[PDB]
Amino acid sequence: PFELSGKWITSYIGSSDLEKIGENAPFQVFMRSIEFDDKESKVYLNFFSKENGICEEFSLIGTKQEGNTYDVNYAGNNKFVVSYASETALIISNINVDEEGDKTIMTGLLGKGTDIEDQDLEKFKEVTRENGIPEENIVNIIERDDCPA
Numbered sequence: 112p113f114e115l116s117g118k119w120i121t122s123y124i125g126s127s128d129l130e131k132i133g134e135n136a137p138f139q140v141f142m143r144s145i146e147f148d149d150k151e152s153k154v155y156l157n158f159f160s161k162e163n164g165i166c167e168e169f170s171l172i173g174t175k176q177e178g179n180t181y182d183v184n185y186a187g188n189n190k191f192v193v194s195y196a197s198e199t200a201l202i203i204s205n206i207n208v209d210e211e212g213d214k215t216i217m218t219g220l221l222g223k224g225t226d227i228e229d230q231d232l233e234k235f236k237e238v239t240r241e242n243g244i245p246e247e248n249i250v251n252i253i254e255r256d257d258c259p260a
């Protein structure tokens with residue numbers, strides 16, 4: 112009834128560690144598209160990220176493992192789930208484990224373009240909360256996004 116597959120833009124991101132989300136850090140992500148293939152139990156993700164100031168396109172394949180949990184390799188291991196959805200937004204949560212074993216909790220509010228409504232935003236905060244991340248580690252990331260469409 113509400114196809115989650117489509118164009119998605121990163122509006123906000125929660126994070127247990129502000130350094131992982133900083134300018135050029137591995138988590139300053141900017142989504143572009145998300146293909147869910149419930150058939151093969153996977154998920155295609157096309158998204159940009161900066162390094163030294165230049166954009167980098169990434170097209171990752173997520174694997175659906177037992178539960179609402181998908182798997183993807185990037186910056187270390189990653190585990191995420193759509194903690195919630197509405198027609199207008201997509202709030203994700205991902206447990207990253209870095210190439211040094213550091214644990215990090217993030218929340219990511221996804222939507223179609225710049226128009227986020229208070230309902231979804233209020234929701235995201237709640238889930239960031241429920242995930243144990245400071246309400247204060249959320250930051251606007253779309254304004255940063257200078258990567259290609």
Ligand SMILES: COc1nccnc1CC(C)C
Nearest residue numbers: 140156171183189191205219
């Ligand atoms: C490719 O996407 C991902 N890969 C690993 C973990 N989380 C995501 C979701 C984004 C929106 C932060």
